[PDB]
Amino acid sequence: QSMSVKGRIYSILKQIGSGGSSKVFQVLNEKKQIYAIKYVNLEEADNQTLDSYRNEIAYLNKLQQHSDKIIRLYDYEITDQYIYMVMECGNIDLNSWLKKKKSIDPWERKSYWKNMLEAVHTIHQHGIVHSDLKPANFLIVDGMLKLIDFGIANQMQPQVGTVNYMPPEAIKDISPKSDVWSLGCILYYMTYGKTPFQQIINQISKLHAIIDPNHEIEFPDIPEKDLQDVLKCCLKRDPKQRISIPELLAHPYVQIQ
Ligand SMILES: COc1ccc(Nc2cc3[nH]c(-c4cn[nH]c4)cc3cn2)cc1OC
Numbered sequence: 001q002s003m004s005v006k007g008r009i010y011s012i013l014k015q016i017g018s019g020g021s022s023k024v025f026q027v028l029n030e031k032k033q034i035y036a037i038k039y040v041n042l043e044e045a046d047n048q049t050l051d052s053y054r055n056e057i058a059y060l061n062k063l064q065q066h067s068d069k070i071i072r073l074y075d076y077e078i079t080d081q082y083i084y085m086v087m088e089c090g091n092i093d094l095n096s097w098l099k100k101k102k103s104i105d106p107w108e109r110k111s112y113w114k115n116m117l118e119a120v121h122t123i124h125q126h127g128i129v130h131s132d133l134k135p136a137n138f139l140i141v142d143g144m145l146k147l148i149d150f151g152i153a154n155q156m157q158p159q160v161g162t163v164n165y166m167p168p169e170a171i172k173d174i175s176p177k178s179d180v181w182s183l184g185c186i187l188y189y190m191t192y193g194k195t196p197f198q199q200i201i202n203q204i205s206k207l208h209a210i211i212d213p214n215h216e217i218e219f220p221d222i223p224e225k226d227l228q229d230v231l232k233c234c235l236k237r238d239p240k241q242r243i244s245i246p247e248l249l250a251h252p253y254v255q256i257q
Pocket residue numbers: 016017024026036038087088089090091092093096139148149
């Protein structure tokens with residue numbers, strides 16, 4: 001199978017992702033280089049939806065330059081019927097990698113954490129709060145984590161819908177501190193092998209636990225005290241009492257050794 005994006009021809013290899021009106025394909029260009037093409041169908045898309053897509057593509061294009069922890073967008077073709085986005089191909093998303101890997105190397109975790117902070121820090125510096133960070137939003141590209149989206153474009157039914165990374169303030173109702181909670185949940189999962197409220201099956205009981213101050217989050221003792229402190233700092237229920245990204249970037253866990 002084959003497709004054209006801005007005059008350039010691409011051979012389709014396999015379908016990566018999907019959605020109600022979107023498909024992601026693994027492709028090859030004329031020079032036999034590997035890419036990901038995100039196809040978006042705009043037939044049933046309303047004006048609100050279109051502007052959400054246009055806004056996200058604009059921010060993805062702009063933030064290319066500011067950090068290599070943001071996915072590469074090489075080119076795109078946008079008409080009234082479709083969007084074709086030629087992007088960087090990743091090895092695997094962080095969620096699939098975490099679900100597959102039994103244990104996680106402490107060096108590998110610290111490395112991924114650094115990348116997650118750099119990517120999220122960059123979007124914040126441009127006025128963007130993601131508000132829905134999960135491990136699925138990150139891509140492993142050459143042992144390096146990259147942020148694939150900014151949470152602007154309207155989400156579609158095909159990890160999606162999950163409340164395990166939701167800050168207490170999002171359940172009550174958004175500031176950059178909201179992303180710190182979600183990042184803290186991802187690190188807690190990479191530390192303890194589960195998210196802080198993963199054991200609570202019932203969604204209502206789970207939402208009640210996240211917002212409950214009397215519901216103490218357990219932080220079992222580990223050889224990395226710096227790591228335990230990060231987790232405790234990210235997971236402060238009060239946004240005003242929570243650590244910021246510039247503060248996490250100066251933290252012993254990210255800087256020592
Ligand atoms: C585990 O399956 C994979 C997951 C991700 C990628 N790589 C990938 C995924 C992507 N999703 C998007 C995307 C951006 N917004 N929505 C989807 C872009 C992109 C680039 N490479 C490759 C995989 O192996 C076949």
